[PDB]
Amino acid sequence: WTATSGSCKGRCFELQEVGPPDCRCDNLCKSYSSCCHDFDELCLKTARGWECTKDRCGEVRNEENACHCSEDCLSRGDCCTNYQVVCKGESHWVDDDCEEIKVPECPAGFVRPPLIIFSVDGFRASYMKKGSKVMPNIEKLRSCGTHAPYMRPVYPTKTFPNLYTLATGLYPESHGIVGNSMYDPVFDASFHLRGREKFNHRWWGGQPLWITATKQGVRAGTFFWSVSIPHERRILTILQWLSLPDNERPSVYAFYSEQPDFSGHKYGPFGPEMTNPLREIDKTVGQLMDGLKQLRLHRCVNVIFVGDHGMEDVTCDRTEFLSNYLTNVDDITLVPGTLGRIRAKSINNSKYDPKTIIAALTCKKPDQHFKPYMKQHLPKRLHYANNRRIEDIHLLVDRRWHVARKPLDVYKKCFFQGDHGFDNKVNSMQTVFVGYGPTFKYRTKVPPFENIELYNVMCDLLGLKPAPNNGTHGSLNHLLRTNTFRPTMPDEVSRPNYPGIMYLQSEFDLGCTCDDKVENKLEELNKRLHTKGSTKERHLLYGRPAVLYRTSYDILYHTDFESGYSEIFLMPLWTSYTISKQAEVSSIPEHLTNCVRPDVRVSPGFSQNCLAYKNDKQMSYGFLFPPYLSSSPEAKYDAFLVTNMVPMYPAFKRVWAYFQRVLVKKYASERNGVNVISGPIFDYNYDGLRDTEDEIKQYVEGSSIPVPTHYYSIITSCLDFTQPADKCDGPLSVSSFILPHRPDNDESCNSSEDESKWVEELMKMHTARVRDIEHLTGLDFYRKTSRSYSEILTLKTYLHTYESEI
Ligand SMILES: *[C@@H]1O[C@H](CO)[C@@H](O[C@@H]2O[C@H](CO)[C@@H](O[C@@H]3O[C@H](CO[C@H]4O[C@H](CO)[C@@H](O)[C@H](O[C@H]5O[C@H](CO)[C@@H](O)[C@H](O)[C@@H]5O[C@H]5O[C@H](CO)[C@@H](O)[C@H](O)[C@@H]5O)[C@@H]4O)[C@@H](O)[C@H](O[C@H]4O[C@H](CO)[C@@H](O)[C@H](O)[C@@H]4O[C@H]4O[C@H](CO)[C@@H](O)[C@H](O)[C@@H]4O)[C@@H]3O)[C@H](O)[C@H]2NC(C)=O)[C@H](O)[C@H]1NC(C)=O
Numbered sequence: 001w002t003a004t005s006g007s008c009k010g011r012c013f014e015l016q017e018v019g020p021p022d023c024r025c026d027n028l029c030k031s032y033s034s035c036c037h038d039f040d041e042l043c044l045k046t047a048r049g050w051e052c053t054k055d056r057c058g059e060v061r062n063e064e065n066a067c068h069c070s071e072d073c074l075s076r077g078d079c080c081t082n083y084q085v086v087c088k089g090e091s092h093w094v095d096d097d098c099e100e101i102k103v104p105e106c107p108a109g110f111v112r113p114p115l116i117i118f119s120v121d122g123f124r125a126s127y128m129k130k131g132s133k134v135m136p137n138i139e140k141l142r143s144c145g146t147h148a149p150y151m152r153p154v155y156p157t158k159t160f161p162n163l164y165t166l167a168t169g170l171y172p173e174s175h176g177i178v179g180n181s182m183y184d185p186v187f188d189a190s191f192h193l194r195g196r197e198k199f200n201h202r203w204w205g206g207q208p209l210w211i212t213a214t215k216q217g218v219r220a221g222t223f224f225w226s227v228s229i230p231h232e233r234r235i236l237t238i239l240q241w242l243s244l245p246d247n248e249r250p251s252v253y254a255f256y257s258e259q260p261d262f263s264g265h266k267y268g269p270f271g272p273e274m275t276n277p278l279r280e281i282d283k284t285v286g287q288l289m290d291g292l293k294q295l296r297l298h299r300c301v302n303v304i305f306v307g308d309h310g311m312e313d314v315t316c317d318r319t320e321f322l323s324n325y326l327t328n329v330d331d332i333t334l335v336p337g338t339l340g341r342i343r344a345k346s347i348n349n350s351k352y353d354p355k356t357i358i359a360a361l362t363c364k365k366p367d368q369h370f371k372p373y374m375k376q377h378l379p380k381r382l383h384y385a386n387n388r389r390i391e392d393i394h395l396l397v398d399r400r401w402h403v404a405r406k407p408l409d410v411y412k413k414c415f416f417q418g419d420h421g422f423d424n425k426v427n428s429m430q431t432v433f434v435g436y437g438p439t440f441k442y443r444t445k446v447p448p449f450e451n452i453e454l455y456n457v458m459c460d461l462l463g464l465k466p467a468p469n470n471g472t473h474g475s476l477n478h479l480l481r482t483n484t485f486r487p488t489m490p491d492e493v494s495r496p497n498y499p500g501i502m503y504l505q506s507e508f509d510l511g512c513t514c515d516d517k518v519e520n521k522l523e524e525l526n527k528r529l530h531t532k533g534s535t536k537e538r539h540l541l542y543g544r545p546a547v548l549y550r551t552s553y554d555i556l557y558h559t560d561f562e563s564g565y566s567e568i569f570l571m572p573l574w575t576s577y578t579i580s581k582q583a584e585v586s587s588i589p590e591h592l593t594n595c596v597r598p599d600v601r602v603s604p605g606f607s608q609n610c611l612a613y614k615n616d617k618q619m620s621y622g623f624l625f626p627p628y629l630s631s632s633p634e635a636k637y638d639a640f641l642v643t644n645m646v647p648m649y650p651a652f653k654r655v656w657a658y659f660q661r662v663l664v665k666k667y668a669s670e671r672n673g674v675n676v677i678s679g680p681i682f683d684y685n686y687d688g689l690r691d692t693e694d695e696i697k698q699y700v701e702g703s704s705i706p707v708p709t710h711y712y713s714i715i716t717s718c719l720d721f722t723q724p725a726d727k728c729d730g731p732l733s734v735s736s737f738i739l740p741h742r743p744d745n746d747e748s749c750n751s752s753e754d755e756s757k758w759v760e761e762l763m764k765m766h767t768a769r770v771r772d773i774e775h776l777t778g779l780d781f782y783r784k785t786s787r788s789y790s791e792i793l794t795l796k797t798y799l800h801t802y803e804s805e806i
Pocket residue numbers: 170171173174175176202203204205206383386387388468469470687688689775
């Protein structure tokens with residue numbers, strides 16, 4: 001109950017929300033159906049419109065008016081935003097030349113430049129160029145400030161997950177808003193766009209920027225706006241707050257527009273009807289900037305213009321129906337649309353089986369427009385598994401498509417022409433970022449980056465210490481004139497051992513064989529130097545990775561590769577090697593086909609054994625340094641060491657062999673040499689983080705050889721490809737992947753064809769950031785470069801998307 005008989009007199013858009021049944025006058029009261037009776041009359045005034053006119057100039061103040069044109073309005077802070085233009089002969093902000101803002105130019109009593117976050121729903125990245133002619137205020141912000149060509153949203157590319165990621169710096173799996181619609185099995189409660197449950201605080205995890213600010217003594221304007229409050233009123237309210245006395249005035253503000261998303265759904269991302277919504281948004285921006293200019297705040301405030309996701313062409317006729325695949329369609333619940341999530345309709349159904357559901361949904365029609373996954377098998381770059389609100393079964397839907405349970409759901413619930421939610425690397429889902437103000441750089445373009453990085457920057461802009469989050473703090477330092485955050489590299493926790501020759505061949509009883517006993521002081525000194533690390537500068541270009549947890553491991557040197565060998569996991573944590581543009585591919589000689597050689601530096605007790613693989617009828621093995629790329633017939637023996645071996649399903653070896661035999665050489669040719677670091681990943685609990693030894697769920701039969709869930713590789717070269725990878729003077733270029741180690745290739749519908757028709761496509765889907773691999777391995781890469789650490793942090797967050805131009 002709310003006894004709405006109290007009053008909003010002097011309380012309009014109050015920052016501190018009052019507790020029921022005391023009626024509310026805050027910018028959310030409408031949403032809670034709890035405003036005081038006089039809210040509309042006092043707080044949502046509209047009389048005379050939103051603009052001053054020549055005859056209103058100098059007028060006597062009339063408190064019924066929506067905004068004012070009287071002499072006292074500036075000090076009162078409630079002039080219409082075009083007041084000085086109409087009445088005092090000023091120019092609109094957009095018509096002024098831009099001038100570098102070297103320092104904040106703020107009124108006396110401002111303790112820090114305010115931050116205003118201007119967020120636009122469904123503002124696709126390509127609107128910046130394609131709509132440039134009709135958005136002159138936004139074009140000025142973009143060209144005069146700091147801008148990215150696009151900003152990557154999080155998956156799923158829906159509104160709530162992305163706005164809450166913006167506020168927290170967290171992946172949806174960690175902040176808990178994993179979709180626009182959710183069932184939480186622990187609460188046994190559902191979250192929906194319509195309705196009351198979404199206001200319960202138990203949905204919302206992490207620590208959003210407004211709480212971070214408050215806890216550290218920085219005042220915040222309210223971020224959420226009830227949909228009915230007109231945009232002009234939201235802007236005038238912000239301007240009024242900025243006119244409060246020093247002790248009451250917030251330092252951070254948010255504006256939110258439901259456009260262009262709302263029209264985008266109805267007309268498609270580029271429907272002709274889209275011009276007007278873009279014009280109207282640009283007009284709102286201009287009202288904000290004109291209003292700031294009137295208050296002498298237009299060179300004081302930092303403004304962020306940011307979208308939550310883009311918009312794609314999607315119509316009713318592009319719907320796949322689960323009823324075309326499943327006979328049991330009524331025993332499941334589908335969360336539908338541009339992604340799918342499936343659970344059992346009833347938990348009392350003992351016959352429900354996710355394995356047979358997956359199989360009935362796998363590669364059944366030739367151009368099937370969705371792909372089923374257990375959530376732990378989704379591309380790791382999506383970070384979309386570690387939450388009980390994410391159903392075990394997931395459908396990744398092709399761009400431009402919908403999935404639905406039955407045809408009746410679509411025609412009984414064509415309206416729409418646009419939608420979003422798809423894979424966050426899809427071009428049409430990309431969104432925008434512009435930063436403008438004294439703290440941002442002037443006329444600067446920065447590379448694309450992910451929205452999880454913004455929370456840290458907004459903290460930096462406000463002098464706040466960020467809560468723990470998924471951004472990499474420092475990786476956006478190149479956006480900023482000052483207030484950069486200067487992190488130190490993490491300290492290595494475990495130092496390596498450097499074992500020499502310590503074991504005789506006959507001490508090994510591993511069931512391994514190699515035809516290698518075929519026999520010189522010239523080249524015997526030479527081989528010992530290679531084993532002492534004489535070629536390590538060639539194969540370890542950026543220093544060895546640092547181990548950031550407590551463990552026991554060895555550095556092993558070789559002619560062609562260097563490795564950090566885990567005595568706990570019985571295999572390398574990492575293997576590093578460089579392949580020049582000139583390098584040659586050879587084959588495995590016949591006599592060495594099943595050769596596995598004991599490593600006399602490493603005890604039998606800390607070694608894998610061949611008998612375990614013989615006995616394990618499902619498990620085979622591969623090598624981290626590829627024998628195919630050995631530098632000489634004599635160096636090739638090193639690649640057959642038991643310490644270079646790793647467990648691989650036969651199905652996975654098809655993938656791995658094509659990457660090692662074909663793709664590495666191809667990249668070396670295209671990039672002028674590549675350095676490669678490859679290794680295993682164990683993430684059995686799908687939390688995105690390195691598993692400890694006791695979390696491993698599968699071993700090679702009869703052994704303590706743990707089976708990786710994934711294999712990574714990090715492929716680095718010179719950004720200036722006219723310099724060879726091993727002789728690079730400047731910035732680096734990287735691409736990486738985290739391939740799932742799976743016993744079949746069901747994921748790849750064309751896998752019965754030659755690897756050249758399907759392996760690269762799989763690899764592209766499982767592209768990764770170095771930083772993703774770091775979380776998954778507890779390693780820290782690029783420790784020894786000639787580059788600034790912030791620049792290296794940016795490199796570590798780079799994702800190679802394989803999408804055509806934006
Ligand atoms: C992205 O960035 C984020 C933020 O840094 C990273 O997420 C963190 O991961 C940490 C490491 O796993 C994790 O630390 C754990 O915290 C537990 C206490 O957590 C509570 O308090 C914090 C602080 O206020 C709060 O943030 C948490 O909020 C989570 O949970 C609530 C649900 O109530 C949600 O509303 C909220 O959205 C968030 O959920 C997410 O995280 C949880 C995990 O905490 C997931 O389960 C959810 O799915 C969702 O993803 C909590 O309110 C603490 O109990 C843990 O300690 C256990 O393990 C350590 C290991 O060192 C051990 O020392 C302890 O003994 C303890 O073990 C005992 O309990 C076990 C389980 O009950 C039991 O098995 C044992 O036998 C022991 O008895 C642990 O320290 C941290 O909470 C989250 N933080 C957030 C905000 O998510 C994330 O990793 C990053 N991602 C990547 C890829 O890098």
